[PDB]
Amino acid sequence: MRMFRITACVPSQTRIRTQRELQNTYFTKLVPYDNWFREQQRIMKMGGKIVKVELATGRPGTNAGLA
Amino acid sequence: MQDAITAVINSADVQGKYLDGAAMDKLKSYFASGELRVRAASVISANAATIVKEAVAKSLLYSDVTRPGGNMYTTRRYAACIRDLDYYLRYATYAMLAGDASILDERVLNGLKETYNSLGVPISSTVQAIQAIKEVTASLVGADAGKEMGVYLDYICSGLS
Amino acid sequence: MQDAITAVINSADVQGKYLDGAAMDKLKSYFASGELRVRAASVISANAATIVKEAVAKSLLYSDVTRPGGNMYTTRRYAACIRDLDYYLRYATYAMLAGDASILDERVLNGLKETYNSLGVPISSTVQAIQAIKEVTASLVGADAGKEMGVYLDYICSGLS
Amino acid sequence: MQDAITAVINSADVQGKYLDGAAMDKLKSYFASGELRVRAASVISANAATIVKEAVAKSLLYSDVTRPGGNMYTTRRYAACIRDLDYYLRYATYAMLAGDASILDERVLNGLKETYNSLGVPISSTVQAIQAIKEVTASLVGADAGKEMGVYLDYICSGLS
Amino acid sequence: MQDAITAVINSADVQGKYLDGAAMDKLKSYFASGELRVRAASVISANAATIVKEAVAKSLLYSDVTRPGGNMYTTRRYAACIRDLDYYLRYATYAMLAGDASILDERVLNGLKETYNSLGVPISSTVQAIQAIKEVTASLVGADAGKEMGVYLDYICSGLS
Amino acid sequence: SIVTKSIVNADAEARYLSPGELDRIKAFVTGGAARLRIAETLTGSRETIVKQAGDRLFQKRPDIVSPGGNAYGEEMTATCLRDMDYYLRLVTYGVVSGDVTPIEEIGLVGVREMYRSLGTPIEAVAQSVREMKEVASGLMSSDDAAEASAYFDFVIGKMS
Amino acid sequence: SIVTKSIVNADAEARYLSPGELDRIKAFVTGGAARLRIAETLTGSRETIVKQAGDRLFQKRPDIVSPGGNAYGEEMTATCLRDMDYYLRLVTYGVVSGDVTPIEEIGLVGVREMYRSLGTPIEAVAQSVREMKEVASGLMSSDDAAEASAYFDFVIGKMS
Amino acid sequence: SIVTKSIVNADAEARYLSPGELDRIKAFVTGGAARLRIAETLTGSRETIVKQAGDRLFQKRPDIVSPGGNAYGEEMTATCLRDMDYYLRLVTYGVVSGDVTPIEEIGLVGVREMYRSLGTPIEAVAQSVREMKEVASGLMSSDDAAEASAYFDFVIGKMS
Amino acid sequence: ILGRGPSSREEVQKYFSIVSSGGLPALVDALVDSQEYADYFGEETVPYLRGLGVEAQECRNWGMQQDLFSYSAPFRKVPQFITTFAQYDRPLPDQHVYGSGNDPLEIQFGAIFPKETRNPSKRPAPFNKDTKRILIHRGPAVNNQVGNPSAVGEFPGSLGAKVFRLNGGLPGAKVGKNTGTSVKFGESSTQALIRAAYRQVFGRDLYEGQRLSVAEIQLENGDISVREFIKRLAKSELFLKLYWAPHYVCKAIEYMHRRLLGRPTYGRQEMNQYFDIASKQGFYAVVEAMIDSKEYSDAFGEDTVPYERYLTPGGLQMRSARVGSLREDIGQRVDKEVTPRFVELGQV
Amino acid sequence: GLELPQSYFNAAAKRQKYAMKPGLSALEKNAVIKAAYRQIFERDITKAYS
Ligand SMILES: *[C@@H](C)[C@H]1/C(=C/c2[nH]c(/C=C3N=C(/C=C4\NC(=O)C(CC)=C4C)C(C)=C\3CCC(=O)O)c(CCC(=O)O)c2C)NC(=O)[C@@H]1C
Ligand SMILES: *[C@@H](C)[C@H]1/C(=C/c2[nH]c(/C=C3N=C(/C=C4\NC(=O)C(CC)=C4C)C(C)=C\3CCC(=O)O)c(CCC(=O)O)c2C)NC(=O)[C@@H]1C
Ligand SMILES: *[C@H](C)[C@H]1/C(=C/c2[nH]c(/C=C3N=C(/C=C4\NC(=O)C(CC)=C4C)C(C)=C\3CCC(=O)O)c(CCC(=O)O)c2C)NC(=O)[C@@H]1C
Ligand SMILES: *[C@H](C)[C@H]1/C(=C/c2[nH]c(/C=C3N=C(/C=C4\NC(=O)C(CC)=C4C)C(C)=C\3CCC(=O)O)c(CCC(=O)O)c2C)NC(=O)[C@@H]1C
Ligand SMILES: *[C@H](C)[C@H]1/C(=C/c2[nH]c(/C=C3N=C(/C=C4\NC(=O)C(CC)=C4C)C(C)=C\3CCC(=O)O)c(CCC(=O)O)c2C)NC(=O)[C@@H]1C
Ligand SMILES: *[C@H](C)[C@H]1/C(=C/c2[nH]c(/C=C3N=C(/C=C4\NC(=O)C(CC)=C4C)C(C)=C\3CCC(=O)O)c(CCC(=O)O)c2C)NC(=O)[C@@H]1C
Ligand SMILES: *[C@H](C)[C@H]1/C(=C/c2[nH]c(/C=C3N=C(/C=C4\NC(=O)C(CC)=C4C)C(C)=C\3CCC(=O)O)c(CCC(=O)O)c2C)NC(=O)[C@@H]1C
Ligand SMILES: *[C@H](C)[C@H]1/C(=C/c2[nH]c(/C=C3N=C(/C=C4\NC(=O)C(CC)=C4C)C(C)=C\3CCC(=O)O)c(CCC(=O)O)c2C)NC(=O)[C@@H]1C
Ligand SMILES: *[C@H](C)[C@H]1/C(=C/c2[nH]c(/C=C3N=C(/C=C4\NC(=O)C(CC)=C4C)C(C)=C\3CCC(=O)O)c(CCC(=O)O)c2C)NC(=O)[C@@H]1C
Ligand SMILES: *[C@H](C)[C@H]1/C(=C/c2[nH]c(/C=C3N=C(/C=C4\NC(=O)C(CC)=C4C)C(C)=C\3CCC(=O)O)c(CCC(=O)O)c2C)NC(=O)[C@@H]1C
């Protein structure tokens, strides 16, 4: 299936976490196409800034065979 | 994943038309080649581990790559390279069955050249390993089937190189 | 990461030999330095918060950052900066005990500069804060382990800037 | 319980109408089959020990079920299995002459699954016993009466499985 | 779960022996009955929603269940009852394809009686709904396929009762 | 396609292709000639199937062609016939692929809320595909009409 | 079997059976007679394949029956042939079922841990199964052996 | 090293170095003289332990040196002793560094699929390292044998 | 003897007192020498089952008498009349909303459920829609999210399960180690995290051929999150074959919720939500809905392996009500023992 | 205490009452004994196991 290569930064707003939080603060990721809407909405209601997003796999305008 | 059949369907859908004779001829060619594809896939699955072991034994073992100071010295790196070669064999078998290398472009050739350049993986040594796998499979599954397997094999070799 | 001992093991593994005389002299040198490293690490671990407070008092207090409009104005941002200085001092103690800065290479400085550029953190101000940390630790533990402490702290400076 | 006549009258009573067009057909088919079903009941009730004898001899004897470690090892368990097969034959006769499996639903299948799962009786071996019952009755009474018993015996088999 | 083929295989494996003649006969019976099962599954998959629609209109619309105070009064209760009918029809189709009611035990009837008893669901009304499902399904699917679907839906009713 | 589904299942399980699906690929690659015979029959006779099916749908459920309905007017009935042409084209794509994944990736996902937005009764769309299936099965050969009607009534079941 | 696998997949996607899987069940149902013939020949000759493949295994790997080996001894060679008979019976079950999930459930899940606890070389058991498929291919007709060797192939792929 | 393991544990718990593990590092530094003298004795006497441990392994399990085995032949026996000398070098690295994690990451991760591809008996390799433990305990003093036996038994437990 | 079930809590109480005082002969004598037995069967009539149509059936022991009149009554070993008569007076019990059988055993691995058929012990109770189940938090009792909803992300130090995170750096994250680096220390940490995530999804460790090596190397390269790795492990076909297919649907939903959130479901709201997801779209959709739920993101980040956060009271009773691991002050008066005052005076 | 109309106990499959009169013949005496055994033991144990 077609995948999204995304990169975003999410800050902490409620607590000062005393453990190492850089890896889940800033990350580059591979999310699926059907889960990308809910993942983006989750991090974006969380309040992060997404810096980059591309189609890692697949091609635009694919009528069939994208899975 | 794009195969010959889905390529025919998508090439029909981009103009919205039905299937003409021009799209019919390549589909008939795929239907003619599919029996040889299934036979070659059965032989490759029958000897999947032994091809990898024999090509590793006569291609890179007891050399400077597996010597200390080489990339393939450590047992972790050795198991990683064995997993990589098994993945290349299995996904090239997938491409041989599907009739297209889009599975290689979408699953294997997605951010691997930069990963190998970052990790210092020897491109020439992987080329030699791919050629050893290709010639062992060409010796094992047959002449025409081995050459058709080697089409996807040197396509993914040129993609990774 | 790698310390001095595992760096010696790395140098042994690259050449594929046992431990020769120079490597064992390096290990004895590390065993000699380990007493001062342990004592300095105990001093920093006992005095962790006070170093941060004297450094932020001599560097960042009564400035445009802690005035409104700066990046220190929210007390959440203040607690974040104190926690960042605690992180830098703790990883500096880790590198001082290890004898190598590979811990700072792999964990802290992996994306710190670009995430500070994304969040608007002033790199010059935190560089001066790290310099203040270095001066406070050098005053606290003396010059003896303080030279290695300064080496690791301005390694953090060079990596961040 | 209910039979075919009660099912017909209940369906027509739920509709509120008379026995118009297909209820009469079902009733006349029932009364046409009835005298031969009574004759088959006479044969089965007369010979009822022989059916369970040939069924246990055909399917369950000389097996792991009857040898030690099996669920038909002790004589109490063997006599209980004989009584269960007598129950299956007799209630299959009841359902075959009623023309409905409601007697099997309310007096057999209501608790048969839970008593066999609590006891540990092998479901597959019980199914094979009932299959031996249905071929022995088909041999001893006839093909048509064998099928008319065997549809309810297969209903009991489906209730087991 | 298991089909008839896997039931034969599991029985032979528990016995520890190979497939004897009666096992081959049962397998040949299932291979004889397979085509009707496949076309019946195609018919039911075609008419999946419509069978539920005419069954609930046949049994439960304009009654005390859909009147106020009944357990199908609200829209969420109607949606849950339609969901339950879809589950029963799909799992009866699965059991018809497998030739075994084991999936009804594993997936459906394992705790559904306690579920309905905790929910307050009238199991008499669900039994009449599944009888309507039987009638509408046997109207559309044929005669022998109607018998098989009726056997498995009556198994669901017997598990409910 | 069927080969595409087998490839993605083998890749998801991280293994080579199973004996059963290899035999399925072999039998499909032999029966592709009959599948393309069904395809060329449908493409040659595509217009009369949709015309008769649209006429039978219109006489069966006149509320579509009635005023206030979903297709009032000749251009909207032509749009409905164009949608039926699209569905017939997707059925031909299904019978050449040997699997229903082209109909999923073009005309099945989101179709319920699609026709919810359009106001089109998707049960009447299912009735139209039923009329297309029965006119096509009456037109072409029955042993091949069963193979075509399997994909047809899968489309009907997903519509309903 | 393939029916159970298709039902499990359809339940996983919460849908009815796709017509591709209906076609695969239909084709398995029509072609099961050849599988029954293969299984009948194997259970008729089931001592002969174990006999010849055990002989060929003791020729090719005499370290197995050498002292210090896993199968050194009369009872140990008896248990070796017992394992060969087990895998032959599993291959007959897989040929009958048309799908390799009974073989996977009975004798391919945890086989590595089992033979690691027993100290048995898994590649040597794979060699024994490969020699069993050689003897069975010699015993059977060409197309039947070519179809029946794929279950042996899955056993080889899981064990080696 | 255990200093790196203590750094990793303190970072995982998000804290500085505890006084107990700092005193552990102190004891490591003070005992480092004996901890390196054991490494120098093993390096100096590294040949004969390999040779007679290999001979004891070969008479314990002669199947691997028997024909048809993995280690049969001059070349295979030579590379078996080469791997034994490599693992002796890993044991010397572990007993100088004080921690079993460098052994676990340089020679002992991936060793199962390594020797599964190679056909090497992992139980025979564990027996070889066991006989190396016995030879080293014979060649060194009792307390030194006890402190080397922890690393040796770590290798044994991770082998099997 | 009487041809009917027990009729009231006081009747069960009286006859239990009789059978406790004098045993089976006293119970039998008290049953036969009663006004009801002499009224119904007299002196010469055989007792008969007084079912639905024989007389008027009371509306209090309906289901219990219906199960008792079946022939499978001597295989329900749990007493059904006294339990229902006590739970009639008492409020709703600690039980899953769909029945007692829907509650798995709170063990390390294995979806072990009570079976309706094998040893019948079904205990229905009318749970309505908004009926939250009281759950016991593993960590601090203050950090229960019922009264402290901002403590969902708090870690249970020394009181609950161990928390696995990607706090350590993954190997190959940066090119600071410009090749070589044969003693790179951090890979056992992420391998341990992978093994712990595998254990959490499938409670016991897998076999060699079952691991998803593509997902493992993707997490080791950093391409996917711990959240995505948990999603792929639960979406794997092994989870389908092990815990979804062989179980009842709501049982599998409950076990999936306990594995993927460390928490039993609160009740009919979450149960009906995931049941509707399972009916409309399926098992994969249930998995991704449970992972993408907001409570999952609050409890665990993108780097945190799930852990057991809440228990049922019955599960906690199974864990901490045994002979060992039960404290002296749980349900017992603790007398402060002391050296006696005369012994204290006798000590010089 | 309860009430039941005299139409419900006219269609609902009445229980056969077995009363041991002293003069009864062998067939109905054995029927009453077997019915008593079925009542006490829920089954016919003297037929199933003697
Ligand atoms: C000599 C003793 C008489 C003889 C015996 C005879 N018995 C059978 C068959 C069976 N007998 C049993 C009995 C038991 N199995 C147990 O476990 C126990 C309790 C310990 C008992 C009492 C069984 C189970 C069988 C069936 C065989 C089986 O294991 O499945 C036969 C065979 C009859 C047939 O029709 O097969 C015979 C011949 N017969 C005589 O006349 C001698 C007096
Ligand atoms: C052969 C049939 C298999 C076999 C059977 C077996 N059954 C029992 C005991 C019982 N069977 C029942 C079932 C019923 N009682 C009823 O009144 C009715 C409907 C009319 C049914 C279906 C019951 C209640 C019992 C227990 C008490 C009794 O004997 O009635 C046993 C004995 C269990 C024990 O351990 O004592 C056995 C062994 N077992 C097999 O393996 C054959 C497949
Ligand atoms: C083998 C022919 C030669 C070679 C290989 C080698 N590979 C690795 C490690 C990795 N390679 C990948 C890349 C992939 N991910 C995928 O999903 C696929 C198939 C589609 C591939 C090919 C990954 C993720 C790894 C693991 C990265 C990691 O180190 O964690 C290594 C190890 C590098 C290391 O530093 O350990 C090696 C050595 N190099 C050779 O010399 C062989 C000749
Ligand atoms: C203090 C020296 C200067 C500064 C501080 C400041 N920090 C933040 C927030 C974050 N800091 C980090 C850094 C790390 N996380 C890690 O895990 C590690 C290694 C252990 C480091 C170094 C991160 C990730 C954040 C993001 C939020 C979080 O807590 O995870 C802020 C911004 C707070 C906000 O977003 O509102 C600030 C301002 N700025 C200065 O001016 C001081 C000189
Ligand atoms: C009228 C505005 C539209 C219309 C209505 C229509 N409805 C039905 C049938 C039913 N509708 C319901 C819905 C509800 N029942 C409730 O109790 C509530 C909430 C208080 C709702 C929303 C139900 C249950 C039925 C089934 C009938 C029954 O009560 O048993 C029909 C009949 C369809 C049939 O097949 O009989 C109709 C015609 N249809 C329209 O086109 C108008 C837009
Ligand atoms: C429809 C025939 C009749 C009926 C149905 C009805 N059911 C519910 C609620 C539920 N039913 C179930 C049952 C299942 N669990 C499973 O795992 C499966 C498939 C194997 C089934 C079928 C469950 C779990 C529920 C609860 C869902 C929820 O919590 O909402 C209702 C709703 C009652 C309510 O919401 O209070 C209804 C109405 N009842 C009737 O009257 C129809 C005749
Ligand atoms: C001897 C105890 C057993 C044995 C040995 C054996 N080894 C090989 C060959 C190789 N073994 C390795 C593995 C390693 N890589 C490393 O970095 C280390 C030390 C950390 C080890 C142990 C490798 C890479 C090889 C190949 C050599 C090369 O450099 O290419 C063989 C040969 C296998 C073959 O097919 O030729 C053998 C036989 N076999 C036994 O039976 C003894 C139990
Ligand atoms: C009348 C308002 C509605 C109705 C009634 C109806 N009830 C029955 C049968 C039974 N009713 C009960 C209930 C009770 N038993 C008790 O002991 C008590 C409290 C003292 C109550 C409330 C029971 C147990 C039965 C079953 C046997 C019996 O009558 O005792 C029926 C008969 C059902 C049949 O046909 O068998 C009916 C019709 N039905 C309606 O439609 C009205 C809304
Ligand atoms: C071995 C001594 C005997 C035996 C074992 C056996 N066990 C299983 C499977 C399971 N065992 C458990 C038990 C546990 N759950 C826990 O939480 C713990 C402690 C942490 C234990 C010990 C469970 C849950 C299972 C189910 C599978 C799973 O792993 O989740 C089996 C398999 C049964 C099956 O049908 O799969 C067996 C055979 N049986 C014997 O005969 C040996 C004597
Ligand atoms: C105080 C009056 C007495 C007392 C109390 C006590 N309570 C607990 C712990 C728990 N209490 C609950 C109860 C609830 N959870 C809910 O959601 C609701 C309704 C909103 C209630 C009433 C629970 C679940 C716990 C477990 C911890 C948790 O929060 O999950 C304890 C602690 C037991 C322990 O061993 O730690 C105590 C001591 N005990 C007394 O002696 C006071 C008289």
CA distance E12 to E23: 8
CA distance D135 to D143: 9
Greatest Cα pair distance, chain G, in angstroms, is 58
Closest approach of E99 to chain D, Cα-based (Å): 10
For residue H33, count other CB atoms closer than 10 A to its CB.
10
Phi, psi of A27 (to 5 degrees): -155, 150
G63 near H CB under 8 A? yes
Interchain CB distance below 8 Å, F160 and E50: yes
| Closest to E44 (Cα-Cα) out of E133, E154, E160, E155 | E133
Q: Least CA distance to I285: which residue of chain G?
A: G13
Enumerate residues lining ligand 8, CB below 6 A: I 52, 56-59; J 2, 4, 8
CA distance B89 to J46: 72
Check contact B-I (3+ Cβ pairs < 8 Å): yes
B1-161, what's its fold?
Globin-like (1.10.490)
CA distance B109 to B97: 18
Interchain CB distance below 8 Å, G32 and E31: yes
Q: Do F124 and G44 form a contact (C-beta atoms < 8 A)?
A: no
CA distance E76 to G88: 55
Calculate how far, in angstroms, residue E130's C-alpha sits from the geometric centre of ligand 5: 22
Map residue A26 onto helix, strand or coil.
Answer: strand
Check contact A-G (3+ Cβ pairs < 8 Å): no
- Positions at the binding site of G for (2R,3E)-phycocyanobilin: 80
B18: left (phi over 0), alpha (psi -120 to 50) or beta: beta
CA distance J3 to H60: 90
- Residue F56: how many CA atoms within 13 Å on its side-chain side? 18
- The ligand 7 atom at the shortest distance from the C-alpha of residue H121 is 43
Q: Kindly list the distances between the CA atom of residue C57 and the CA atoms of C50, C66, H143, in Å, as whole numbers in the listed order.
A: 10, 11, 54
- Within 8 A of B17 by CB-CB distance, chain A residues are none
- Within 8 A of G147 by CB-CB distance, chain F residues are 23
CA distance D14 to G159: 64
Question: What letter represents residue I310's amino acid?
Answer: Y
Q: What's chain E's Rg over C-alpha atoms?
A: 18
> I136 CB under 6 A from ligand 10?
yes
Ligand closest to Cα of I98 equals 6
Contacts of E131 (CB under 8 A, 6+ apart): E59, E153, E157
Q: Report the b/e string of C47-86 with b at 16+ CB within 10 A.
A: bbeebbebbbeebbeeeebbeeeebbeeeebbebbeebbb
CA distance E41 to E145: 9
Within 103-122 of G, beta carbons closer than 8 Å to H belong to 116, 119, 121-122
Interchain CB distance below 8 Å, I99 and E115: yes
Interchain CB distance below 8 Å, A65 and F93: no
Query: Between I183, I185, I191, which is nearest H8 by CB?
Result: I185
Q: What's chain C's Rg over C-alpha atoms?
A: 18
**Nearest CA residue ID for atom 41, ligand 8:** E64
Query: Between E109, E110, E114, which is nearest I124 by CB?
Result: E114
Question: What letter represents residue C141's amino acid?
Answer: V
Interchain CB distance below 8 Å, C41 and H29: no
Contacts of H47 (CB under 8 A, 6+ apart): none
- The ligand 1 atom at the shortest distance from the C-alpha of residue D62 is 30
Question: What letter represents residue H59's amino acid?
Answer: Q
Q: Do I182 and H106 form a contact (C-beta atoms < 8 A)?
A: yes
Segment (H or E) for I131: none
Q: Kindly list the distances between the CA atom of residue I283 and the CA atoms of D107, G3, I232, I243, I275, in Å, as whole numbers in the listed order.
A: 38, 19, 12, 11, 10
CA distance A7 to A29: 6
CA distance F130 to F160: 11
Q: Least CA distance to B86: which residue of chain H?
A: H117
Calculate how far, in angstroms, residue D75's C-alpha sits from the geometric centre of ligand 2: 13
State the DSSP string of C19-68.
--HHHHHHHHHHHHHHHHHHHHHHHHHHTHHHHHHHHHHHHTTTSTTTST
DSSP H63: T
Calculate how far, in angstroms, residue E128's C-alpha sits from the geometric centre of ligand 5: 21
Instruction: Quote the Cα angle for F28-F29-F30, to 5°.
Output: 90
Map residue A51 onto helix, strand or coil.
Answer: strand
Q: What's chain G's Rg over C-alpha atoms?
A: 17
H96: left (phi over 0), alpha (psi -120 to 50) or beta: alpha
Q: Supply B112's token pair.
A: 């691997």
Interchain CB distance below 8 Å, I98 and E114: yes
Check contact G-C (3+ Cβ pairs < 8 Å): no
Instruction: Quote the Cα angle for E4-E7-E9, to 5°.
Output: 115
Beta bridge partners of I45: J19
- The ligand 8 atom at the shortest distance from the C-alpha of residue I53 is 27
Q: How was this structure determined?
A: cryo-EM
Chain G: partners with 3+ C-beta pairs within 8 Å: B, E, F, H, I
Q: Kindly list the distances between the CA atom of residue E128 and the CA atoms of E89, E156, I53, in Å, as whole numbers in the listed order.
A: 14, 12, 22
Query: Between E27, E98, E107, which is nearest G96 by CB?
Result: E27
Interchain CB distance below 8 Å, I55 and J4: yes
Within 3-32 of F, beta carbons closer than 8 Å to I belong to 12-14
Calculate how far, in angstroms, residue I57's C-alpha sits from the geometric centre of ligand 8: 9
Q: Report the b/e string of F34-70 with b at 16+ CB within 10 A.
A: ebbebbebbbeebeebbebbbebbbeebeebbeeebb
> E78 CB under 6 A from ligand 5?
yes
Q: Kindly list the distances between the CA atom of residue G88 and the CA atoms of E25, G59, I256, J45, in Å, as whole numbers in the listed order.
A: 21, 20, 37, 48
D115 near J CB under 8 A? no
Q: Do I283 and G12 form a contact (C-beta atoms < 8 A)?
A: yes
Ligand closest to Cα of I263 equals 10
| Closest to D30 (Cα-Cα) out of D64, D1, D6 | D6
Burial of I341 (0-12, 13-18, 19+ CB in 10 A): exposed
Chain J: partners with 3+ C-beta pairs within 8 Å: D, I
Ligand closest to Cα of I7 equals 8
Phi, psi of A53 (to 5 degrees): -160, 130
Q: Supply I288's token pair.
A: 């991704």
B contact set with G (CB within 8 A): 42, 45-46, 48-50
Map residue I151 onto helix, strand or coil.
Answer: helix
| Closest to C137 (Cα-Cα) out of C52, C28, C10 | C52
Handedness of CA G69, G74, G76, G77 (dihedral sign): positive
CA distance C48 to C93: 10
